[PDB]
Amino acid sequence: GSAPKYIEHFSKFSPSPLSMKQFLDFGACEKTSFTFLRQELPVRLANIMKEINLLPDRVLSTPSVQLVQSWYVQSLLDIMEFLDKDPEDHRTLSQFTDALVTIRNRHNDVVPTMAQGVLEYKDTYGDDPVSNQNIQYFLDRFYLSRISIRMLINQHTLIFDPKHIGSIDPNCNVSEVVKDAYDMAKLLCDKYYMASPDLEIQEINAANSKQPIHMVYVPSHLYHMLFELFKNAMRATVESHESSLILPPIKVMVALGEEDLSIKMSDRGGGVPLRKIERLFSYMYSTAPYGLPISRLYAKYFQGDLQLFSMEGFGTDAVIYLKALSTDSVERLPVY
Template identity: 55%
Template structure:
C-alpha cells in the first residue's frame, strides 16, 4: 500500500490551501468561556475551518517521513484515515448553517473520533514493521521522534476540539454536571491521583500478586489550608498519572522481588503562584543516567511488546509509548513532565501544570519551512569529544544504549 494511494482529485490542493494557515491555539479559559455560552453555530463556524487547518498541517508532514517508513502498511492505514476525515470535514466548508447541517456535523465529528480511536496503536505497529524490515540509523530515528511528537500532539488537540463540541452539543453528557465539555472547572487533583492509583494497583495486584501503598501529601502556598483545585481536563491528568503509577509500581515490585514489604509510592502536590506540581516518588532502584535520554523515545522500550497470546491479561507495560505520550499530554497546555533519578534508590517524576487557566494555552505543531527543513537536514556533527565516534571511551559510553537492552530496575517505559 503506497501512502499516496488515496490522495487524488481535489484533496492535494485542499491540503496545500489549508496548510498555509497556522492553527489557532486556545487556552483553557477560552474553552471554558465559550462552553458556558455554548453557541453551536459559533462552534461549527470555528471548527469547520480550524479542524482542516490542524489536519492539513500534520498531514503535510507525513509525506516528509523517510521513504522506508512511508511504505509500511500500518502507516498507509493511518494516512488513509486522515485523508478520509479531512474529506468529510471540508464537505461542510460552504454549507448553509441550518439545524440539519449542525446535526450532520456533530455526527461526522463523532464518526471521525471513533475512526481514529486506535491510531496510536496502528502507528506503533508501523514503527515495529519498520524496525523488523530495515536498519534504522540515527538520522531516521531522529526524524521519526520529531514527527511522532508533533503527530500525537496534533491528535490530542484535534480530539480536544471534537470532544468539546460533541459533549456540548451532541446530547451525550459525560456524567459530570459541573463539567464544561470535557473540562472540569474545579478539578480535584487528589481525587484524580487516587483514581489513577487504584486502577494501576488493580493491574499490579493481578500481575505481581501485591502492590505498593500510596502516600499523598499536599501544600497549597497560595490558598493556605484549602484543597488544591485546577481548571483542567481530568482525563488528561488521569492518563499521565496512570502511566506513572504503572511504571513506579513495576519498578518497585521488580526491584524488591519476593520481599514481604514494599516501600510506598509517595505523591506530593504543591500549588504555587504559576504552577501546580505533582511529584511522584518511588524507591524502585532508579535509572542509570546513561539511560535517561532513552526514556522518552518512541523507538525504545524497556518492556517486551504485548503478546497476541496474552490478549486476556493486561501487562504493566506495552509498546513503550507511555512516557512520551504522557509528556505530550502535560505539554499540550504548556505544562511538562520531568524525570529525576538516583540510581540504586529510586525515581521522581514531576508533572508541571499551569495554575492559571488563561496561561494554559494549547501547544500546537505548525507546518512551515522550519519543520520541513528539519526532515531534510542530516544530524549535525558533534562538537564535544564525548559525542564523537571512534574513541574507546565513547564506544563504552554508547554500549548498552541500543534498543535491545532493558533498563535495570528503573521506571518501565
C-alpha cells in the first residue's frame, strides 16, 4: 500500500482557511468546488493523520486510535481515486458527491470512539495533569480538524444535489435560534424534572436601537452550543431550588457590537467555584466508564470563543463570542 507516502506528500501543504464570505460565494460552480475539494480534503486529512502518528506507541497502539486511523486511511484513498479524473465529465462529479456521503458516514462515531481511548488511557496510565494537558492539546486540535472537514463536505453535498446556502444562513435571527434551543431543552427538562425555568431574552443592537439582530452564521453550530448551555443552566437552576419555591428564569442577552456578536446566558443555579471551572472543559476529567469542550470548539472554529464565569452561591454566566462581520469569520484550522 501507498498510505504513508500519500500522507507524507500531502502533509507538506498547509490546509487553507476559508471565510463565510468565500463560503457563500461558492453557492453550477460544481466543477470548481470539486477541483478544490480534491486537493484540500487530502491536505487536511494528511495533516491530522500525520499528527495522530506523533502520538506515543502506548496511545497509538490502542484499538480506538487504530480504528479511527483506519477510517482516515480509507477516506484519503477514497478521494485519491479522483485526482486524475475529469471535471468536465458530469458523472465524475456525480460519483464524487456519492463518495463524500460515504465518507461522512464512515466517521459519524469518532466522538465516542475517541472517548474510549481517553477512558482506556485514563485507567491504563493515570489521570495526571501532564497526561491531561496532552489529551487536551491533541483533542481540541483533532476535533477542530474534523469539524472543518464536515463543514467542507456538508457545503458540497447540500448545495450540489435561494435563501440558505447549504448550512449557512446569511440572515440568521439569533433570538429565533435561542428560543428554539430553549424550547427543546425545556421539553427534556419537563420530562426528567417536571419543572423548568422560564426564559427572558433582551437584545442590544448598539448601532441600531430597535432593529432585530441578524448575522451570517451556521445555525446548527449555534443551536448545538445554545442547547448545551440551556441544559446546563436548567440542571443547576432546578436542582439548586428543589427545597425552594421560586424558580428563577434563565436570562439571555444578545448584544451586537462593531465586531463581536455576543450571547450571554445567565442563571441562578448556585454556581461553581473558580477552581472547578477548568475541568468542565477537560475531555479527560469529564469522561467516565456534544459537551462544553466541543461547543467551545464550534465557537473557536470561526474565530469565536465560549467562556464561563460563575459566582459560587448564586449562579453561572456563559457567553458565546462570535464575529459579527462575515469578513472576520475565517476557519481556525490546526496544521502539522
